[PDB]
Structure 1
Amino acid sequence: TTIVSVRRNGHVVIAGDGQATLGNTVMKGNVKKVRRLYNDKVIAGFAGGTADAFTLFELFERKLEMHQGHLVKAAVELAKDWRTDRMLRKLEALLAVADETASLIITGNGDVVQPENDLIAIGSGGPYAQAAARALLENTELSAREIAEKALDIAGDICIYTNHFHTIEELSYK
């Protein structure tokens, strides 16, 4: 699995592969690891079980309602309940979410992280995508969609757990 997020020129995107591996075999190649949330004001992705993310994303929208859509404060309340609750602690996934404000990662250890330049790359292929996206972001004028697309394809050629099926959700705020 690989998921990438890039932010440039008033645009931010999240892209991810569709591969679902079981042991050494491919279970499903068209998985939708990216979706929109909170009245399509937020984009998010996940690396892990599909139901585990749908549970976390739904609660994340409830934390946004309590905090009026504030991304960072809702992300900490989600990470707080995630490590806390005995039921949520069992969940195993790597969340990625972003809005016009900023991009950040969420984890089951309770750690909330905003990468340098708001460049997120997670999953088994994440480090590979981060090395490609860091190269284009500094040496090209390409739009964030073009970077996340080409970076994800490079990670699929490298990572055996990632494929070239793609799903993207751009957000323009300019």
Structure 2
Amino acid sequence: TTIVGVKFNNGVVIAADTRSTQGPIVADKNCAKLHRISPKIWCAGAGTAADTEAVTQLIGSNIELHSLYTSREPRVVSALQMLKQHLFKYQGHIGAYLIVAGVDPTGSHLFSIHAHGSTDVGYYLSLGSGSLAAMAVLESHWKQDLTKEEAIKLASDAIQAGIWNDLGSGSNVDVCVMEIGKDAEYLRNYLTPNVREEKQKSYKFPRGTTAVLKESIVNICDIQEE
């Protein structure tokens, strides 16, 4: 997994690859790692995939109820505080490593959070098995006062470094841009540099190839009238 977060002029961008694995095997070739906590607060997860999914969904649920209770749009610091206190209580047994980014009435924010409950602040961050490849790109090309277009470019370049150089990462680049005073724009499959080539042969079988012992209709309908 490769995930990055990058601050820019009027907001923040996050990005991720689309490969999920069980050991050396690729379970899904087009996984969605960019999760929504709230409309304008998004996060990307590395580590145990169920934990990052589960934790995002729990805090996202509680954030929504909090927003309704307070009549205020949710803040990134609230998501951060709730995530870290939940994770700290479970002493690293919930294996969620997240980059959290978003905009709110206070401004634009970018945080990282680790499974044991520690958090950090930054202008550019990377997490996952391809984080070192991504951070190499970020440390080479990051500058202060990036534009929206420059930040999207930098973020996707950092994910590409993970895709090509980290075996744990691959396939496509997903991006989400969160700008102040605007709707967050989720860009699913922003880059597609890994389409499989046409196979040499068709493996469609002739009909009747497989040996069959018994056929029967399965009743999926409910008990009928009359």
TM over 0.5: yes
Residues 8-32 of structure 1 show CA distances to partners (whole Å, capped at 9, x for unaligned) of 1213111111111222222221110
How far did 1:146 drift? 0.7
Greater share of strand: 2
Equivalent residue, structure 2, for 1:137: 142
TM-aligned CA distance change 1:75 to 1:11, over 3 Å: closer
- What is the distance in 2 between the residues matched to 1:103 and 1:64? 20
8 A Cα contact 1:18 1:166, kept in partner: yes
Match of 2:170 among 150, 160, 163: 163
Equivalent residue, structure 2, for 1:103: 110
TM-aligned CA distance change 1:12 to 1:151, over 3 Å: same
Equivalent residue, structure 1, for 2:44: 45
Residues 1-174 of structure 1 aligned to structure 2 (within 5 Å):
1-38=1-38, 40-61=39-60, 62-63=62-63, 65-66=65-66, 69-85=74-90, 89-100=92-103, 101-115=108-122, 118-138=123-143, 143-173=150-180
SS in 2 for 1:124: coil
TM-aligned CA distance change 1:153 to 1:134, over 3 Å: same
- What is the distance in 2 between the residues matched to 1:58 and 1:11? 24
**Letter in structure 2 aligned against 1:43:** W
Equivalent residue, structure 1, for 2:203: none
SS in 2 for 1:143: helix
- For structure 2, which runs of at least 5 residues remain unmatched after alignment? 182-226
Greater share of helix: 1
How far did 1:2 drift? 0.5
SS in 2 for 1:78: helix
**Letter in structure 2 aligned against 1:2:** T
Q: How many residues align?
A: 169
TM-aligned CA distance change 1:95 to 1:64, over 3 Å: farther
SS in 1 for 2:7: strand
TM-score of the aligned structures, taking structure 2 as reference length: 0.67
TM-aligned CA distance change 1:43 to 1:122, over 3 Å: same
Equivalent residue, structure 1, for 2:191: none
| Greater RCO (Cα-Cα under 8 Å, separation 6 or more) | 1
Q: Report the more deviating stretch, 75-84 or 153-162.
A: 75-84
Equivalent residue, structure 1, for 2:188: none
- For structure 1, which runs of at least 5 residues remain unmatched after alignment? none
SS in 2 for 1:169: strand
Identity of aligned residues (%): 24
How far did 1:64 drift? 6.7
How far did 1:49 drift? 3.3
Q: Report the more deviating stretch, 118-127 or 40-49.
A: 40-49
TM-score of the aligned structures, taking structure 1 as reference length: 0.85
8 A Cα contact 1:7 1:119, kept in partner: yes
8 A Cα contact 2:12 2:109, kept in partner: no
- What is the distance in 2 between the residues matched to 1:60 and 1:106? 14
Tell which structure's C-alpha radius of gyration is larger. 2
8 A Cα contact 1:60 1:75, kept in partner: no
**Letter in structure 1 aligned against 2:98:** L
**After TM superposition, which residue ranges in structure 1, 4 or more long, deviate above 4 angstroms?**
139-142
SS in 1 for 2:161: helix
8 A Cα contact 2:35 2:56, kept in partner: no
